[PDB]
């Protein structure tokens, strides 16, 4: 999914001095938001958890409850997201798209399609431990049809391991996709799901090329031509992630920031979930496509402390 994040372990880290630094920034009338945003933004997540622990043993206070009572809005929502242990952030985001009453499919899609099987295994485990219920049971209860089925397949976190290309198998899957969509009166979604959901990543990159070659269409155009609604978005997320997780996340960031507004929720989530994985690589793919740094888009799209914090996450 990887290569590099923007946030790194600060050197000569002292969670006791940091905890006092944060106590100071909140103690009394007012909040020193800048001292908060600068400290939390230059501490890796593991270090934020140590701070939180030091704070509680120093003052008998919950750091998270204090930040929430001192901060407000998006900047708040961003600090809260940043304090969330890495291990639980995606489970949280997933939990939260499944509740409140109405289901947020863009969040299921985004996360399930862009995380690896190894990340999904981890995610399934912590969601169960944290919410009791099974991620899988919760998706299915809130979704239906091929969209639900495609998510269930991905949730198995059982994609074939990369392994030297079987050209006969590449031609057969490309031909199968050709026959299931373009040559078919209607569509065979089941075939798309099986191939997208279980073939190895190196194998599907090859299938996508062979598919183009055979049909004169990119698989994304076919998806657009043959599917609609939630399934379409997902199939496109999966294909884009196969091709490049970074590129898909960069793209996700972009469309978050271009409307007559800003998707703060989305914006936070990708910047925070990927800061210690591949935000760096998302940076370069943002520039590469869209032509513009993420810094400026963000810089031009956001205000305040929020803006400062975001840019602090992003860099260069």
Q: Rule CB under 5 A: which residues touch Ca ion?
A: 26, 68, 72, 76, 184, 187, 224
Whether the CA torsion 113, 115, 116, 119 is positive or negative: it is negative
Beta carbons within 8 Å of 294's beta carbon, 6+ residues apart: 250, 253, 282, 283, 286, 287, 314
Q: At what angle do helices 15-26 and 33-40 cross, to 10 degrees?
A: 160
Kind plus residue range of the DSSP H or E element containing 80? helix 73-83
Q: Residue 104 — left, alpha, or beta (φ > 0 → left; ψ -120 to 50 → alpha)?
A: beta
Residue pair 63/74 in contact by the 8 Å Cβ criterion: no
Residue pair 307/74 in contact by the 8 Å Cβ criterion: no
| Distance, CA of 20 to CA of 55 (rounded, Å) | 7
Phi and psi at residue 215, to the nearest 5°: -100, -20
């Amino acid at each position: 999914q990887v290569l590099r994040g923007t946030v790194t372990d600060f050197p000569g880290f002292d969670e006791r001095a940091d905890a006092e630094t944060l106590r100071k920034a909140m103690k009394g009338l007012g909040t020193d938001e800048e001292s908060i945003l600068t400290l939390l933004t230059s501490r890796s997540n593991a270090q934020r958890q140590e701070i939180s622990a030091a704070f509680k043993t120093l003052f008998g206070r919950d750091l998270l409850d204090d930040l929430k009572s001192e901060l407000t809005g998006k900047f708040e929502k961003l600090i809260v997201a940043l304090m969330k242990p890495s291990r639980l952030y995606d489970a949280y985001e997933l939990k939260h798209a499944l509740k409140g009453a109405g289901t947020n499919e863009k969040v299921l899609t985004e996360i399930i399609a862009s995380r690896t099987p190894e990340e999904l295994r981890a995610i399934k485990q912590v969601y169960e431990e944290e919410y009791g219920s099974s991620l899988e049971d919760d998706v299915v209860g809130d979704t239906s049809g091929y969209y639900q089925r495609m998510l269930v397949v991905l949730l198995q976190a059982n994609r074939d391991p990369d392994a030297g290309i079987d050209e006969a198998q590449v031609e057969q899957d490309a031909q199968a996709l050709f026959q299931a969509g373009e040559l078919k009166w209607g569509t065979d979604e089941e075939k798309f799901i099986t191939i997208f959901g279980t073939r190895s990543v190196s194998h599907l990159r090859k299938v996508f090329d062979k598919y183009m070659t055979i049909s004169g269409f990119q698989i994304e155009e076919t998806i657009d031509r043959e599917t609609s609604g939630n399934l379409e978005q997902l199939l496109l997320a999966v294909v884009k992630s196969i091709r490049s997780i970074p590129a898909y996340l960069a793209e996700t960031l972009y469309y978050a920031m271009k409307g007559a507004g800003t998707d703060d929720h989305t914006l936070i989530r990708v910047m925070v979930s990927r800061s210690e994985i591949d935000l760096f690589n998302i940076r370069k793919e943002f520039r590469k496509n869209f032509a513009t740094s993420l810094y400026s888009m963000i810089k031009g799209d956001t205000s305040g402390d929020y803006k400062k914090a975001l840019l602090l996450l992003c860099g260069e």
